[PDB]
């Protein structure tokens, strides 16, 4: 369940290439993966590639993996540490949720920031109040850092 399931998920992701979201083994250690996310086209993060480190606890699938960002992003849900407070990895987790669902959920969060979970309440309030300034800041950050 901690190695056969991982091999099955890796084989499944190796069959159909999403061409936008990719996952790979860091060297040879099946409990540590790197995820590359393409920026959503209809989002201020358009054209910005993002990197994530995914840790598989040994109790997988009974315990969810941990994803951490590396590239900075002016987002109301991603601080400088690269943490992600995503409900799918703490509450809405079931043994059948493969790692592909996690990447798709993160992509959805990037497209549509969720103000119900203000990891950094300042940026969330700025977005709720000054939309244009928030989007300008996000695009400037994407240009400076992602590029």
């Amino acid at each position: 369940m901690a190695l056969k399931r991982i091999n099955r998920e890796l084989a499944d992701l190796g069959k159909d290439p999403p061409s936008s979201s990719s996952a790979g083994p860091v060297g040879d250690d099946l409990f540590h993966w790197q995820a590359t996310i393409m920026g959503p086209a209809d989002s201020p993060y358009a054209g910005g590639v993002f990197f994530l480190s995914i840790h598989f606890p040994t109790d997988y699938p009974f315990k969810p993996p941990k994803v951490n960002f590396t590239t900075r992003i002016y987002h109301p849900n991603i601080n400088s540490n690269g943490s992600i407070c995503l409900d799918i990895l703490r509450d809405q987790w079931s043994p059948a949720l493969t790692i592909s669902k996690v990447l798709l959920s993160i992509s959805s969060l990037l497209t549509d920031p969720n103000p119900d979970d203000p990891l950094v309440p300042e940026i969330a309030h700025v977005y709720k109040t000054d939309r244009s300034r928030y989007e300008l800041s996000a695009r400037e950050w994407t240009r400076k850092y992602a590029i």
């Binding site: 703490r90 119900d116 979970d117």
Partner: protein, 75 residues
Amino acid sequence: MQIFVKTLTGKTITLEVESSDTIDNVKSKIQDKEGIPPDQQRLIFAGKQLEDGRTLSDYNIQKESTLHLVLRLRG
């Protein structure tokens, strides 16, 4: 008509409602029969989440429809 709602714990609750009954009416019925506030309760039916301001007929709820109870938000 009559419908059935299953909670997260698997408890089955029978509700005497109608197709034209509003979502608010069913939420009030569930609150009266259980005590949970209507806003906290969310009903999943055929991939559709019931929302205030609509009716059961809007969600194609029919005789002996099975719904699922879920929550909304957590930190």
